[PDB]
């Protein structure tokens, strides 16, 4: 009943609307840092000069964009990897034209998702679960250190993370097909086959236990009142959604137990983004899609193309095109 | 060649399983 | 390139380094063997 | 009155031979013998009145000069154009392959 | 003491001119015969100031202070030339070669940012007659080019260029092309500025001068599509005399 | 279409003399050019310096003309600029700087024709393709 | 006019972010 | 920025008038229980 | 009770197997560290620098100073075979008693003696298996060091005149310098502990880190924790497994950044370039070829009011233009002589650059760390012909995939033994359901 012990209770308590807990210490103003931030920038903030060329790009609605245009600029390629907080620079002028406030976002950002991460597993515990929501978690979670952390740091310049911003987003993943291809490579091939077979399996999933619900009510009302929160029973009958996919199929490609069917639903997506989050953090160093160009010829020599070369006229369309004035020497080597 | 001889050590594990479960042994 | 008395190993060593992946895939020829127990 | 000045560039004999006070230095490999030793000390030595003035660029020796004899006819000499000449342009003019 | 790379690096001195002790206040005496350069010319900027726009009647408006917005990125240094004896006693000063431009942008209040190539290109400055040496009292005066902040090639954000780009609004396919020729059309400008050096201090042993300087000159044009600001800028050099 | 003689033909010198490469030398020259000379020249360009390409109406303009067999092999054994004028054998791979550039070390006189035939035959089969770049690919 | 709009509905969710978690109907056991 | 002056009023009945739905179903919806 | 695919778990409580377990794997670590190198020796050409031909490991041998001299050449492969049988030859020892021991030994060592079993509660015998096993990694730091100043000495991309093997006589002790590595900003211009750029830190923070593991295996033998650490921690074999797996994956993340940055211990000779290091060199190339042609690359506006060859970083330092201006904290034994105290000297650029200099920009230009799955070399659009990926690709991807996986492991193990500890890693039981006794939220 001293101060520490009452403060650290309230902290841990399982009583507070929403959970603290000491990731949520950290998780809380970090977050709050980053909201804030964003929302003063998408708003206000003036053009930035993501390229370090003194070409400021404007992305603030006030400054001529709407919702779709609009983003938080990307800091300067003359910071590169540099730190540059706001009392590093000589005025909030300064600060302001040369990218300071992604920097300010991204890393309160990243700081507080990963505190959300612990912050799942801290609850489980002191509910008495079991812990392992936070490693679902870890996909998304190591998708967004990629594109917002990884890859600068690899490519040397967190001018080349992703924009905040919806167009900017689009144009993040256009230059990435162009100086990577990740359209082949096979990360990114396990990101889409993780994404659409956990398309597919929501769907199946919600439309199986749909199917079978037990008839608990009238016509006159959803069929959702048929189930009461907490109630022990299933509010489905398995076998009848077993028998009916195990016909669609065969009798072996369907789950008659709910924890295998369950973890299948986990596994899939969580597997394939992790995949995909570590095909963005090995592009980042450069280890890039399949090329195929030019790898058939015919018996005089003469090149045939496939898709493949098709692929690489529009790669190549991308990289001459963007950042149109930042180049100065013929290769684009980051 | 080379495809001699990682047969004769590809064959060397699936060889061992089959001694001792044909002796009936301590798998 | 190796030293010259054991060239006649060639072949033997561009295959060596693959062993260890092997050991894995006997682990799962072992556990066929008892089903998976 | 508002005029593209290199388009209209183009429509002089800049566009159709060698231009001592304008082109950049990689058209003088378009014939042999000029580059780079020959094309160097042409275009630090711009600007030129007349195609001929080439000839009497200190230091050429009478094999340069017979080189720029064979050639006179490749070349032709325009007023300067400020947008070709600045950002040092003629000796990397942003083109590679 | 002379310091390394690593001791500057990060720092900011950089940026910065080299310095003479305020005991510096000799003379360096010029040999009508002999010959001489400038080894290094160093020009750091403190200010730059913005003329204004009055609007109403011929008021003519004011220099008005703004504030850098790109860092310590601004000095020009390494700038080199003939330092010539006239047959008046009078020195000229022709640059040759250096470090001779850098972009500044710098902001004024409201939020206009004012792109601005500082330079001193071509630089022929020159001192009053019967020289005969250099000493805290001289100054040197004179006219520099300012060619077009962009150079040919740069493409604007619709991919219009002068060198280089779309001649048109493509984006636009049948709009009326005449209220988009200034966008469309680029022009590269070519102004002159002028400068005034003040040699405040002079190492009679070492060759060695430094002092003020202010400079007047025009800011970026956007390639012809609005008209550039005027502007002034004062700040510091360093310079070191040799006989060639 | 095929590699045929006719592709396989290419001048020996200036004086107009011609040799017939056989489909070995051709091979032996791609690979042995990708060894030593493509991580620069992938392609018939120059990625160091895009001015100077393999194109054959390239080699024919340079001083000495390397448009031809014994050209090149002089090429690759004293490398001189293009007008003739320099040598350039400490920045360019030559047998007469194999001391700082080892992969010409174990070149043999017939890998030095290999290589320079690939050079003049492939520009036959690719066409613009050969020296002009991306625009190309 | 579309500042303000855009402005307008990114705030009338957060404020539905606030009364869909401390006014939500509550879960209630069986 | 020259904006379609009409997509005001479009966003305006496009958020309003369902919304107005949904509050007036909910409502006497409370007024029963 | 453990399904066959979580098998391992049955170890747990069987200190002789588990023994066995990893000894056998730590055989087989040894065997690919043999084969690997007789791999890469069997396909070595001494005429091609070894970052093109996809090795990994000899490079790590030649930084020790075996087998090479002046500029990198090799003179000398006995080394390498030396280094490959003997890790071969014993993979056979350790194999031979993780065998042994996971299979015909004593299931369980506690009975057999009381020095080797162990309790995984057992704090006291926890921390002096600990302290041994620090004593032991202090005895191979110092090893490093022996090498350095007394077998031989180390590579030295440094050394005057292109490099060469070099013996360390004055290591680093002052612990403002060690120390101050550790205190370094991560960000750039800064790199933390990835900017040490010479042999003398490099030694002088292994004889700090050879002491401070001695002298804390000595600590932990002779104590127990203190109970704010009693209380603190969960004690339990999984847990002390879950506290390994983070500590690995942050040791990856770090060895992913060496690699990639560093070419001190890394040395480009070896390696390839590094990514910043490459992007110099295209504009270094591109500078000298121009300059030769008569450009003043000093003055020379480009295209966006920038210098085109040179400009100003943020803190005014001269440096290369272009996009390579995200790569100006740059440092290399190629261009440091061109540096004066305000950055790239310009009376250098124009006067004192060597061909030496020219050759190796252009060598790393042409061999900038960029490639495909398949080892096309270069950007993604060109075309075949380059067979080549840098191996600093692809020890920076491997190592980063590894670390995230062993992060997500630590998260994986450290969940499950607190809750094993708690009791509830099997499930809620459904009689005393914790949250059906608390207050509802509303
Ligand atoms: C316990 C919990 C830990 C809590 C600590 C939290 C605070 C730490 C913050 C970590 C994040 C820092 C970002 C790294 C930024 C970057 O520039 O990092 C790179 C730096 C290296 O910096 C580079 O270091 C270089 C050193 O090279 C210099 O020196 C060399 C000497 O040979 C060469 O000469 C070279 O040319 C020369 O430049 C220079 O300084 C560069 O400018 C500089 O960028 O690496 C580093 O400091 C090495 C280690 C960084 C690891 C960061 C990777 C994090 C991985 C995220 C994991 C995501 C997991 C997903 C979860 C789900
Ligand atoms: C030092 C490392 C280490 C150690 C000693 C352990 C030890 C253990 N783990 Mg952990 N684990 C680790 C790292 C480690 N883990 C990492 C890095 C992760 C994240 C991926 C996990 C994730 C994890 C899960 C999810 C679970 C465990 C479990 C277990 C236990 C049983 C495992 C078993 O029998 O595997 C049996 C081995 C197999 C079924 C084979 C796995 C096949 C892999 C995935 C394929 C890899 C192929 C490779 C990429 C190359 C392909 C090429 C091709 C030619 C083959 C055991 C205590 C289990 C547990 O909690 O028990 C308490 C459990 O359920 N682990
Ligand atoms: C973990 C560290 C590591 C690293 C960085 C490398 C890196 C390299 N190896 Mg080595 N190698 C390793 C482990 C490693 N290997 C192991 C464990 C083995 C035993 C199988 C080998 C066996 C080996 C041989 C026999 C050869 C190489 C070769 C090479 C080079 C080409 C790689 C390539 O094209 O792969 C292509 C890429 C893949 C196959 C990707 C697989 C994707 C995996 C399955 C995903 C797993 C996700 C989970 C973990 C490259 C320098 C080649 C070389 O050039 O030799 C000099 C070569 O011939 N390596
Ligand atoms: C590095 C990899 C590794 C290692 C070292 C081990 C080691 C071990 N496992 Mg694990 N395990 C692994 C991978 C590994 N496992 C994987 C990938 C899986 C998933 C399929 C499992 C699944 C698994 C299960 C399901 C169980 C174990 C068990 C065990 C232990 C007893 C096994 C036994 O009696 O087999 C007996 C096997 C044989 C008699 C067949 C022959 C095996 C020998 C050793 C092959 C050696 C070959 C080699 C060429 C010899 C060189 C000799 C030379 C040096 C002289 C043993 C310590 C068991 C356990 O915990 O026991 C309580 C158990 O129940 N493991
Ligand atoms: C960390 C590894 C490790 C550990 C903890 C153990 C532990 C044990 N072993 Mg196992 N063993 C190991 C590795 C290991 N062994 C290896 C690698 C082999 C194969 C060669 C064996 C083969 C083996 C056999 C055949 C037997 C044991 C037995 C035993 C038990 C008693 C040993 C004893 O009294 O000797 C105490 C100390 C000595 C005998 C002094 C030996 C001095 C050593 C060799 C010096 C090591 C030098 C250096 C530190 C490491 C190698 C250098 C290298 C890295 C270059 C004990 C539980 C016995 C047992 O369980 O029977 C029931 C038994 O019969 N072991
Ligand atoms: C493998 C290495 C290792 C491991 C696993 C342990 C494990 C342990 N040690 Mg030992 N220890 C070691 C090496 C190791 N030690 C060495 C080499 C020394 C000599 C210096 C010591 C000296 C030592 C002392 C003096 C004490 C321990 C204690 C303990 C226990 C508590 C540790 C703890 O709470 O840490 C958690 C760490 C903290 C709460 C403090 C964090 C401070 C660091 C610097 C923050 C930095 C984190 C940041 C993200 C990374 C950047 C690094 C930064 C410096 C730049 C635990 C059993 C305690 C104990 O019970 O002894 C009986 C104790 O008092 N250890
Ligand atoms: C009450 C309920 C109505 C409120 C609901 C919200 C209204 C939503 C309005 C949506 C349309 C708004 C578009 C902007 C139009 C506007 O601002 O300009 C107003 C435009 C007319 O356009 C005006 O025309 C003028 C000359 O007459 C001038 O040219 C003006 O510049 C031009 O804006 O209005 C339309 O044409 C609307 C009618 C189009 C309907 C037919 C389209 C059929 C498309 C098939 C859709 C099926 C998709 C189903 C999806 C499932
Ligand atoms: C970069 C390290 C290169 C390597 C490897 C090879 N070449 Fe090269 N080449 C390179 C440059 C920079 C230049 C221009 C040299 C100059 O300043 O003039 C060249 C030029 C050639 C030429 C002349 C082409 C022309 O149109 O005149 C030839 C014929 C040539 N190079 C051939 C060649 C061969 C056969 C190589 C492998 C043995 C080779 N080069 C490697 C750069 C590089
Ligand atoms: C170095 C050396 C050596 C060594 C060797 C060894 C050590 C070996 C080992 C080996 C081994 C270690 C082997 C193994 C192998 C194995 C295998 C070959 C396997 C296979 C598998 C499979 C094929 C699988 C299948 C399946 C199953 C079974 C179930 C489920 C499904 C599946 C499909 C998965 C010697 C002596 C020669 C001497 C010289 C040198
Ligand atoms: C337990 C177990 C396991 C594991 C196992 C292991 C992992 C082991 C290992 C082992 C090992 C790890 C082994 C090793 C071996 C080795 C050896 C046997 C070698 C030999 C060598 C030699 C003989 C050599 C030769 C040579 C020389 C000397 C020189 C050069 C050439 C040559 C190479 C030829 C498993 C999973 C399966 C299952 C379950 C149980
Ligand atoms: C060698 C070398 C060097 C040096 C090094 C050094 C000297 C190092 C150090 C290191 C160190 C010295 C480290 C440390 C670390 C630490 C850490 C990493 C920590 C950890 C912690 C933790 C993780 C914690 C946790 C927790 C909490 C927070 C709360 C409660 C619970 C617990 C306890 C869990 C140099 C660079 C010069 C150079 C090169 C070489
Ligand atoms: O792709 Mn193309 O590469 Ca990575 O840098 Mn060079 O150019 Mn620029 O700044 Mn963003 O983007
Ligand atoms: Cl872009
Ligand atoms: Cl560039």
Known sequence: ANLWERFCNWVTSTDNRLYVGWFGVIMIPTLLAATICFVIAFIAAPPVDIDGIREPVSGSLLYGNNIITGAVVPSSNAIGLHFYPIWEAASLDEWLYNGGPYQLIIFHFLLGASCYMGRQWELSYRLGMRPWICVAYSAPLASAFAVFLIYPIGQGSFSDGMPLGISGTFNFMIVFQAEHNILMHPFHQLGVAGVFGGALFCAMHGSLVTSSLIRETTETESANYGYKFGQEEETYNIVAAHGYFGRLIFQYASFNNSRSLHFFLAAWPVVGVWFTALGISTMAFNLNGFNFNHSVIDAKGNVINTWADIINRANLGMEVMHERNAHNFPLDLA | AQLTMIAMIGIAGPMIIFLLAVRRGNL | KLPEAYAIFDPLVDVLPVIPVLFLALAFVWQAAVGFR | ELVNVVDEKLGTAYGEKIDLNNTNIAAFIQYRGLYPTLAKLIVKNAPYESVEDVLNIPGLTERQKQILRENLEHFTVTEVETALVEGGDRYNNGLYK | QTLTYDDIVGTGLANKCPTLDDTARGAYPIDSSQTYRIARLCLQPTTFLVKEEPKNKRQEAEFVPTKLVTRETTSLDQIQGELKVNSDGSLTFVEEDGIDFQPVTVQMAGGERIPLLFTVKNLVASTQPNVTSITTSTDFKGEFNVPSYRTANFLDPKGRGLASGYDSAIALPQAKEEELARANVKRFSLTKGQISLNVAKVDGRTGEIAGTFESEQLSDDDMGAHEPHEVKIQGVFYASIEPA | AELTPEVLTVPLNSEGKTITLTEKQYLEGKRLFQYACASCHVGGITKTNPSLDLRTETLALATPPRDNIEGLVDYMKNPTTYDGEQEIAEVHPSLRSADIFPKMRNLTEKDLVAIAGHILVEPKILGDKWGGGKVYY | ?30 | MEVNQLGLIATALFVLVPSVFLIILYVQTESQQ | GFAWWAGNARLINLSGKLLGAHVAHAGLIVFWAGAMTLFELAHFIPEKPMYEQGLILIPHIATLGWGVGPGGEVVDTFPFFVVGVVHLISSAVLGFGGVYHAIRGPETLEEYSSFFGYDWKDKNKMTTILGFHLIVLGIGALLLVAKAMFFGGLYDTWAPGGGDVRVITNPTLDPRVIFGYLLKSPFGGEGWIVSVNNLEDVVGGHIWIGLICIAGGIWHILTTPFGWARRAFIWSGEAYLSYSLGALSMMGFIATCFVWFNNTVYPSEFYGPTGPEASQAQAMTFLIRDQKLGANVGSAQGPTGLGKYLMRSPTGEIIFGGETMRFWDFRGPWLEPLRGPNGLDLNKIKNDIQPWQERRAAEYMTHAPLGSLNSVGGVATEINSVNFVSPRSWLATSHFVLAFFFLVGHLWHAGRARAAAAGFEKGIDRESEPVLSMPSLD
């Open chain 7, 1 to 30: 006019m579309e500042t303000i709009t855009y402005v307008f509905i990114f705030a009338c969710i957060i404020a539905l972010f606030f009364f869909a978690i401390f006014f939500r109907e509550p879960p209630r056991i069986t």
